[PDB]
């Protein structure tokens, strides 16, 4: 170990953890909790990013002086990856969208940023490489989303062979677009789910939950070459997960079923928004979409993380979806949904 | 100080008080911002002789406290009683 | 006749020193030490059991009449049993003076408290157990003044270090202000400044 | 009226101290050795406290000396051996306590520099 | 005077670089290093040595009370230079 | 609107400043009374210098004091603005307050002059002033004092006979002679109520026992009666400079003792004994006697004290200071009883509170 | 000598009465309390077109941190650290050796900027003038560590400044 | 007969005199009840019987207060008063018995 | 050994005021959970509550005892007023602290500290 | 002693005597105490120091160009009471108020000479003697500091 990067101190705010990470995608949902992460026991951050300087504020409180690195950065454009990651003893990949662009499409932020992500950091020398996939890639899927998971898992498996490729469920959390999304569809009166939502089984796992599996990966040295799934606890039926949402945010479930063909339709009427869709096609497909059983595969628990039960941290992400009435409603009130053993 | 006569009279009797005599903005009437330099006096112990330190030493005369009573005729006041105060013959009713 | 150097005031001295006595004279029940200061401040020394007879025979008579109380406070000095020193700074308009009466306790030794004499004690003996840890029994509200709500500890001991033991940061994970031991990016340097050679022959102290 | 308690004086759990720096801790009580540049000996007349040092680490930004101990700097002064002890058992600390070291008196005679017949007999003034 | 590392990052007048593989120099990217390019040390080593006619001279810094306190060099060596300690003028004896 | 019980929570300011003073020569130790009623800077320096100056058994030369007077009487000025101004500004009446604030303007420019910083002058210190006043400075200040009468009146032609002024103020916060002593008032809060004192004159320091001047007595204990002290308090702090200006004798600025002030730059660079006292005055600092004062002054807000606690050494043992607005605050409760919710507003101003005293 | 403030007998003949109902029901001195804002109205406003135009310093003034040279271009600092001892915020940290040369001088002159209080103790204590404050006031920054400054900030900023602050010097430094 | 004392709260006494004749002697009979040698009895009767010799010798309110020096007249009511309620507490406390208890060996030694 | 007593003559008058101030507190968490907005649940709330009254179960001396069930209420008087916030009462639970090994090799691995 | 000057006159300058790598001589330093030569005979029995010429001139040093390395040359630097001879390798590092000091002991023999480690910052900056009488007294050999 290079002497700059020797651990001291007490795993805190003021202390050097040896971590140089460079996050790509930290300012989106999964990123903050990761910059946090890193933040906390003193690792220096570069947190390149494409958005306007405005939208990384956030993340600067979460180091001690100098410990957070901005750059900008193009996924175009490898010099920008190429500086960023020069100095880095490991590189995360964050970067993706639910809906295409017409200057992104899932192709370009699933496979070709991945790719060059990992190629850029292999010639670097840089040493640990973390990959966000997701557990129901697949290309059989319906979903583009999905099939572009598949290949670009591939691709960055060929490209850096001991990159850690990590496998998530649907995450739920404060700043998600899972349980928020469900919650939001009260502005249209009836929840609409394709045969009822009977026919489908989602196993979502918890933000933080993920956060503490990619930091753990960073630093166990069995990580390497790996890939794990990382799930929720429990398995449910979506009608339940989606009543459940409905009763822990107080609001009246009316659910009624929609075919696919007119519930794929409505999808592609929401995708006319030039800015960010409310849903989309894919996201109607992903939704719908049971969540595959791995048992080949290391999940959290290979990790030392305990996967914590949705029911423990619902409230926590839907107290603010409740009306005034509503809001002072304790933990206890609601039942848990109906698992699946 | 640029104000025209009638402006001058019109606030100047809106105020009741005459104010160009007393105005508030500085003009020329202030010190100029380049002075001439100061020749500083010195104090009393610049001497070259009957100036022994030990004879002007302000700490070292400085004694512990007087134990009065220690657990090991008339009545007295901590002071006189303080003198009343006269009423102002500058203004004894503002 | 020596610009530098402070005059004294011997009649003050004089005066103080009769009036300590006066006090020692009738209050002998409570009071241990009296003594004035070079530049004339008289100092009573009591039982702490005496706070309540000492202090309100000082407001209330009539060759005293020390109806401000000034400062109310406390001195931590840890190399005593009775770690803490209460002292009492009263002001008697009528008689344009000043006093101060001294006592003392230990962390587990309650004090009479001094509202029922002054009114103005009320703030300042919260402040006292506040800052030091010391209990002023029949306080009509006795809590933390100046620390943060549940602050741990009582910053003023001699003991207490002096950047704590918590720092506070937002955590954006739980979305609120947290509590976490303190680390400093830069270690408070501590300076040995004392001379090793003595100052003051008058306060020498027998070897 | 007074009570009897007959325990021996303990207020570790009314001092806000944190558990660990209780019982991890090492005081040391001692009278400081005198600065041999110098000859004064007025700092060498009180009993000192203080505590075990720990981890000091450079600060990444400005190379700046870290630290993650609360007590570092803390320092407290004492009249006699025994109120140090007093403070350190009812604080529950861990101590080690150094028996003060006084100069031995010396022999001290100008005329031993011109002996007759001795070693002491100096070779320069 | 202002070397390059290898790396091309400049050398202080402290001798300071981050070396190869030091992830520290990550903070000058996108900006730049701060580097006083005036070294003293080359600066005071081109003023001339001052020719003076006895044994013992006096060096203030120059500028009277603005200058340093007044300090006295021996100039009795003849295999060397008097330098002051405050602000390293040079002097030598005249013969 | 009525309220039952107010419950003040201070401690919001507060910090630790005599826990860190206890690390601090006292040297190092006196820019912290600067940032305490951070409104009246100098004499909070003041009355430090004071309390140091008494255990060290020094004293400041004559032109220091008069300089300190005449400094002390300008703070007072910048004080009374803020505290008339800011309790007008919250009883609704907002103008009055930027007339009055291009006056501390330039009462912040005598500051900067004599010590390069607008408030936090760290200009008193023991042994008398850093630096003598600059040349052609008391002209100006001359120039100032003459208008600041007028512009006295112009406040009081807003709010002395406004009747809206005076229903918010008359009658309000009512507090009697005898309270007000018993729980602790000092300064206006007392002389409202009639009570006379002022430590000006009844315990004189530096040269105060020098100067004319009249101590404003009010009748009623209210607001308003405190309101007009403060008021003619300003009148009689420019009768005070008037003399103060006028009476200004010449030599030096700090006790002509060079192990407590610092010698001259000059003299450091040419005499060995004032080398060696700068280099141990600038680190060591000078030691004071062992010894305990409590030493207050007539600071604008009312009595300012500190109690001091040598062990001998360069270093404080403690420094407790006495905030008037710390007695003041806790009598908040009992003043407002049987008024309503704007009324508190104007309790508060009258009080005159600064935080940074109250908590520290 | 005291004066009281409100103590006042009102008149009770007929005029003083009428006058006093006059007050009331025409409002006479509220109306006067508008001609006082109306005179200000007309004056001339003390604001000033910042940043074209600036507000008066003097030469003491206490601003942005300087390390200065001697004439011939070597630094005043000797690494004495006076000024670090002194410093009533702790923010100087110095490193010292010696220098390639036999000459005594820093390796290390930092300040903490958010830590410093602009007191001027550090130039008071210096004794070669090597720290002083500057005239600057206009260096606000966009982050934290800008305003942590290390010795070749504090060197530029005197080679930057030396001009004004040489000629602040010596209008002062017959006061000190 | 004065219009007002000038203190806030403190109401102008129709019958000064005749109130400090009634005042100084209620402290009397209270102070008669302390035992004889001590000094609070001693001192508090000496000072008592002063003033009450200079309420009966001065009849004019205005010269009343220039002997008694102790500000208005309702000032000194009030006084007497605070010594009537200080004397019957003196009795309870008892602070003419000897000291309670020494301190310890250096309570009072400063510096340490 | 003969000393002033704060509130309570002996440890069994101790320790009637400390089962009051328990109960005083166990009524309190359902309040505080509702009051506050915790995601915390109420059993939570009083296995707290009961850790820090098993923290201090070996003292033996009643005027230490006096002081923490002092300290105690005015922590609860803090808490029913809502003087504290949210923070105040989450700063019991340590979210964002990391596990510290207690072991001897975890803590030879990280550093120095015993 | 006095808080001013009244000496008008110019000062004396001595130059300056090398005596080996550990002990720098700044001699316009010296107050002429003789506790050097005093040392260097007595105690570590080297009669190489000494004073030469007379009046205000007498200068003290070698006469000749000569190295002091004795293994216990090192505590002149202690008992000199200026800055005279000072540590050539603690040469500008740092200042005494600055320094925490440990007491420890010495390992270079089995003597176990009682020192002070002064460290700064985390640096340990030198190595001075703490009294022992039964030990070293106040001395260290140089290998030791
Ligand atoms: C709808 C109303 C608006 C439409 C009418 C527009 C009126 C014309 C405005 C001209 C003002 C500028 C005058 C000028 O030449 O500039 C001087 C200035 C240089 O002069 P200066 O030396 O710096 O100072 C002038 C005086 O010495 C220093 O100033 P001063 O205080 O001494 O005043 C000088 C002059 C300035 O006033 C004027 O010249 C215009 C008067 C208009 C009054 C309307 C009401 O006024 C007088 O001379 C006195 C007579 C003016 C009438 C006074 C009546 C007071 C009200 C009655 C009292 C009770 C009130 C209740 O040049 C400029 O800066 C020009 C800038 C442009 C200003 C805006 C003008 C256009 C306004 C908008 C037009 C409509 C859209
Ligand atoms: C021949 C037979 C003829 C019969 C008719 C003859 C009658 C003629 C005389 C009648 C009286 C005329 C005036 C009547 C108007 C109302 C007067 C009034 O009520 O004002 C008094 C009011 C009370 O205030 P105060 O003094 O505190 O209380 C009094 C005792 N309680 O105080 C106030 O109201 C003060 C209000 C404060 C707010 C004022 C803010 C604005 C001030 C400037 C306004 C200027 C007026 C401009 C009007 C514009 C016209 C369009
Ligand atoms: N339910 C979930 O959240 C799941 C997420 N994942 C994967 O985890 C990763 C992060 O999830 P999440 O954080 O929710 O994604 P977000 O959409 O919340 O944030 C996406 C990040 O990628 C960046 N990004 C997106 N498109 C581009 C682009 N074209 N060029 C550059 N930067 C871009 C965004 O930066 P900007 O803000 O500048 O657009 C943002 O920082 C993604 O790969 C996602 O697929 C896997 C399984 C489930
Ligand atoms: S101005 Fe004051 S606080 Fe700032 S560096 Fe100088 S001495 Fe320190
Ligand atoms: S800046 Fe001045 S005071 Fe500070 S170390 Fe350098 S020479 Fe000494
Ligand atoms: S010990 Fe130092 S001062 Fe004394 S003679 Fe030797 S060199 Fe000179
Ligand atoms: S520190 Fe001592 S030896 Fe060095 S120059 Fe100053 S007085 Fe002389
Ligand atoms: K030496
Ligand atoms: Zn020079």
Request: contains cysteine.
């Amino acid at each position: 170990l290079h002497h700059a990067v020797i651990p001291h101190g007490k795993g805190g705010r003021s202390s050097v953890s040896g971590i140089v990470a460079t996050v790509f995608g930290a300012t989106g949902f999964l990123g903050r909790y990761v910059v946090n992460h890193l933040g906390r026991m003193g690792s220096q951050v570069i947190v390149p990013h494409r958005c306007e300087p405005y939208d990384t504020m956030h993340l600067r409180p979460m180091g001690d002086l100098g410990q957070i690195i901005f750059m900008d950065w193009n996924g175009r454009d490898k010099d920008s990856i190429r500086r960023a990651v020069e100095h880095s003893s490991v590189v995360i990949n964050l970067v993706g969208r639910e809906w295409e662009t017409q200057n992104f499409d899932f192709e370009d932020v699933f496979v070709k940023i991945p790719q060059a992500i990992a190629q850029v950091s292999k010639e670097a020398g840089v040493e640990k490489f973390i990959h966000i996939s997701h557990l129901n890639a697949d290309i059989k899927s319906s979903s583009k989303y999905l099939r572009s998971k598949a290949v670009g898992e591939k691709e960055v498996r060929e490209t850096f062979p001991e990159a850690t490729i990590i496998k998530p469920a649907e995450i739920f959390g404060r700043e998600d677009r899972f349980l928020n999304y469900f919650a939001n569809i009260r502005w249209f009166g009836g929840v609409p789910l394709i045969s009822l939502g009977k026919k489908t089984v989602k196993q979502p796992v918890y933000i933080v939950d993920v956060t503490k599996g990619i930091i753990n990966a960073i630093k166990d040295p069995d990580a390497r070459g790996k890939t794990f799934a990382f799930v929720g606890p429990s398995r449910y039926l979506l009608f339940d997960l989606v009543q459940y949402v409905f009763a822990v945010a107080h609001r009246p479930f009316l659910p009624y079923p929609l075919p696919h063909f007119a519930y794929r339709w409505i999808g592609r009427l929401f995708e006319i928004s030039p800015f960010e869709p409310w849903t989309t096609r894919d996201k109607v497909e992903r939704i719908h979409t049971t969540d595959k059983i791995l048992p080949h595969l290391p999940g959290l628990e290979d990790l030392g993380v305990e996967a914590t039960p949705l029911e423990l941290k619902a409230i926590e992400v839907l107290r603010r979806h409740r009306t005034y009435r509503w809001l002072s409603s304790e933990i206890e009130d609601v039942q848990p949904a109906k698992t699946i053993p | 100080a640029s104000a025209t006569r009638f402006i001058q009279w019109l606030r100047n009797w809106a105020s009741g008080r005459d104010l160009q005599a007393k105005l508030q903005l500085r003009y020329q009437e202030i010190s100029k911002r380049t002075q001439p330099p100061p020749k500083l006096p010195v104090g009393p112990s610049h001497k070259l002789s009957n100036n022994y330190y030990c004879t002007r030493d302000g700490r070292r005369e400085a004694m512990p406290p007087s134990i009065v009573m220690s657990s090991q005729k008339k009545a007295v006041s901590p002071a006189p009683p303080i003198k009343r105060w006269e009423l102002s013959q500058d203004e004894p009713y503002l | 006749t020596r610009p530098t150097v402070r005059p004294r005031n011997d009649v003050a001295h004089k005066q103080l020193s009769a009036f300590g006595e006066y006090v020692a004279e009738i209050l002998p029940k409570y009071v241990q030490q009296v003594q004035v200061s070079c530049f004339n401040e008289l100092e009573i020394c009591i039982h702490p059991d005496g706070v309540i007879p000492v202090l309100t025979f000082l407001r209330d008579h009539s060759n005293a009449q020390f109806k401000s109380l000034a400062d109310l406070t406390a001195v931590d000095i840890p190399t005593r049993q009775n770690r803490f020193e209460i002292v009492y700074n009263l002001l008697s308009l009528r008689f344009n003076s000043r006093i101060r009466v001294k006592t003392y306790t230990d962390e587990l030794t309650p004090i009479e408290s001094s509202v029922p004499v002054y009114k103005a004690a009320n703030w300042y003996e919260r402040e006292i157990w506040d800052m030091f840890g010391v209990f002023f029994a029949n306080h009509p509200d006795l809590r933390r003044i100046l620390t943060d709500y549940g602050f741990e500890g009582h910053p003023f001991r001699k003991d207490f270090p002096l950047s704590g033991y918590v720092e506070l940061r937002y955590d954006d994970e739980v979305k609120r202000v947290v509590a976490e031991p303190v680390e400093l990016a830069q270690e408070f340097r501590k300076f040995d400044l004392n001379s090793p050679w003595e100052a003051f022959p008058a306060y020498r102290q027998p070897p | 009226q007074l009570i009897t308690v007959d325990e021996k004086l303990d207020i570790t759990t009314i001092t806000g101290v944190p558990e660990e720096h209780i019982k991890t801790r090492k005081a040391r009580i001692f009278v400081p050795a005198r600065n041999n540049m110098q000859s004064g000996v007025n700092n060498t007349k009180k009993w000192k406290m203080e505590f075990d040092t720990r981890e000091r680490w450079e600060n990444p930004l400005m190379g700046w000396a870290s630290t993650a101990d609360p007590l570092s700097n803390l320092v407290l002064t004492f009249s006699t051996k025994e109120d140090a002890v007093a403070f350190a058992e009812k604080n529950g600390w861990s101590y080690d306590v150094e028996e003060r070291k006084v100069p031995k008196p010396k022999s001290k005679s100008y005329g031993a520099n011109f002996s007759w017949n001795k070693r002491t007999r100096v070779s320069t003034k | 005077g202002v070397r390059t590392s290898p790396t091309g990052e400049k050398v202080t007048h402290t001798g300071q670089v981050y070396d190869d593989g030091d992830y520290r120099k990550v903070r000058f990217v996108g900006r730049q290093k701060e580097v006083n390019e005036n070294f003293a040390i080359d600066l005071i080593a081109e003023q001339p040595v001052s020719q003076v006619g006895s044994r013992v001279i006096s060096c203030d810094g120059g500028g009277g009370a603005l200058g340093h306190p007044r300090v006295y060099i021996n100039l009795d060596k003849e295999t060397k230079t008097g330098t002051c300690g405050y602000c390293g003028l040079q002097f030598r004896q005249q013969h | 609107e009525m309220v039952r019980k107010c419950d003040p929570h201070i401690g919001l300011l507060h910090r630790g400043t005599e826990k860190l003073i206890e690390y601090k020569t006292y040297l190092q130790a006196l820019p912290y009374f600067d940032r305490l009623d951070y409104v009246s800077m100098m004499c909070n320096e003041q009355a430090y210098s004071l309390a140091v100056e008494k255990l060290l058994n020094i004293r400041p030369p004559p032109r220091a004091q008069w300089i300190r007077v005449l400094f002390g009487e300008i703070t007072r000025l910048l004080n009374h603005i803020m505290a008339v101004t800011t309790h007008a500004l919250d009883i609704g009446a907002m103008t009055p307050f930027f007339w009055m604030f291009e006056e501390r303007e330039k009462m912040f420019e005598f500051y900067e002059r004599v010590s390069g910083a607008r408030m936090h002058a760290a200009y008193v210190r023991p042994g008398g002033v850093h630096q003598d006043l600059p040349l052609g400075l008391m002209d100006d200040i001359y120039e100032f004092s003459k208008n600041f009468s007028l512009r006295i009146d112009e406040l009081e032609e807003m709010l002395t006979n406004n009747r809206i002024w005076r229903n918010r103020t008359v009658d309000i916060g009512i507090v009697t002679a005898e309270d007000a002593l018993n729980y602790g008032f000092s300064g206006v809060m007392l002389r409202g109520s009639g009570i006379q004192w002022d430590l000006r004159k009844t315990q004189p320091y530096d040269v105060y026992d020098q100067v004319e001047f009249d101590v404003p007595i009010g009748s009623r204990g209210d607001c308003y009666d405190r309101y007009l002290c403060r008021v003619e308090e300003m009148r009689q702090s420019i009768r005070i400079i008037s003399q103060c200006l006028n009476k200004m004798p010449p030599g030096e600025i700090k006790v002509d003792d060079a192990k407590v002030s610092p010698p001259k730059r000059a003299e450091m660079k040419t005499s060995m004994e004032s080398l060696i006292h700068h280099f141990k005055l600038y680190t060591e600092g000078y030691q004071v006697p062992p010894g305990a004062t409590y030493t207050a002054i007539e600071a604008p807000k009312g009595e300012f004290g500190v109690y001091l606690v040598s062990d001998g050494s360069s270093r404080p043992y403690r420094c407790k200071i006495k905030a008037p607005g710390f007695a003041h605050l806790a009598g908040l409760d009992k003043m407002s009883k049987g008024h309503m919710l704007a009324d508190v507003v104007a309790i508060i101003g009258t009080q005159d509170i600064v935080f940074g005293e109250v908590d520290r | 000598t005291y004066k009281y403030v409100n103590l006042r007998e009102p008149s009770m003949d007929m005029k003083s009465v009428t006058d006093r109902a006059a007050q009331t029901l025409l409002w006479t001195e509220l109306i006067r309390g508008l001609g006082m804002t109306l005179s200000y109205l007309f004056r001339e406003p003390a604001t000033i077109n910042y940043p074209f135009e600036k507000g008066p310093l003097s030469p003491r003034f206490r601003g942005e941190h300087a390390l200065r040279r001697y004439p011939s271009g070597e630094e005043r600092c000797i690494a004495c650290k006076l000024c670090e001892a002194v410093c009533p915020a702790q923010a100087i940290t110095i490193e010292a050796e010696p220098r390639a040369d036999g000459s005594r001088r820093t390796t290390r002159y930092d300040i903490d900027m958010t830590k410093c209080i602009y007191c001027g103790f550090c130039q008071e204590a210096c004794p070669v003038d090597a720290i002083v404050e500057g005239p600057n006031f206009e260096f606000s920054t966009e982050t934290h560590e800008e305003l942590l400054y290390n010795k070749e900030k504090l060197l530029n900023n005197g080679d930057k400044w030396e001009a004004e602050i040489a000629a602040n010097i010596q209008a002062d430094y017959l006061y000190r | 007969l004065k219009k007002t004392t000038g203190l806030v709260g403190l109401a102008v006494c129709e019958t000064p005199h005749e109130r400090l004749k009634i005042l100084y002697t209620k402290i009397l009979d209270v102070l008669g009840h302390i035992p004889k040698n001590a000094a609070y009895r001693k001192y508090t009767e000496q000072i008592t019987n002063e003033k009450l010799s200079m309420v009966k010798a001065e009849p004019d309110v205005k010269k009343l207060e220039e002997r008694l020096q102790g500000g208005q007249i309702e000032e000194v009511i009030l006084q007497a008063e605070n010594e009537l309620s200080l004397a019957r507490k003196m009795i309870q406390w008892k602070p003419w018995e000897p000291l309670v208890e020494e301190p310890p060996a250096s309570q009072w030694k400063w510096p340490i | 050994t003969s000393v002033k007593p704060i509130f309570s003559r002996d440890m069994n008058e101790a320790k009637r005021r400390v089962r009051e101030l328990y109960r005083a507190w166990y009524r309190e968490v359902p309040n505080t959970v509702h009051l506050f907005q915790l995601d915390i649940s109420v059993k939570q709330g009083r296995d707290k509550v009961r850790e820090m009254f098993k923290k201090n179960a070996h003292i033996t001396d009643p005027r230490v005892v006096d002081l923490l069930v002092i300290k105690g209420k005015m922590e609860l008087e803090e808490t029913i007023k809502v003087w504290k916030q949210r923070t105040h009462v989450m700063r019991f639970f340590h979210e964002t602290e990391a596990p510290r090994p207690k072991d001897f090799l975890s803590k030879f691995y990280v550093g120095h500290d015993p | 002693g006095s808080d001013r000057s009244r000496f008008l006159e110019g000062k004396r300058a001595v130059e300056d005597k090398n005596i080996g790598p550990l002990v720098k001589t700044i001699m316009t330093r010296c107050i002429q105490c003789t506790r050097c030569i005093r040392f260097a005979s007595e105690i570590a029995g080297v009669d190489d120091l000494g004073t030469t010429g007379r009046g205000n001139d007498m200068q003290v040093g070698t006469y000749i160009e000569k190295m002091f390395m004795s293994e216990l040359s090192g505590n002149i630097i202690d008992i000199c009471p200026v800055g005279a001879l000072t540590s050539k390798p603690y040469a500008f590092t740092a200042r005494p108020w600055e320094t925490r000091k440990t007491e420890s002991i010495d390992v270079m023999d089995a003597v176990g000479s009682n020192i002070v480690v002064s460290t700064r910052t985390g640096e340990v900056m030198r190595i001075l003697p703490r009294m022992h009488e039964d030990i070293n007294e106040e001395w260290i050999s140089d290998k030791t500091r």
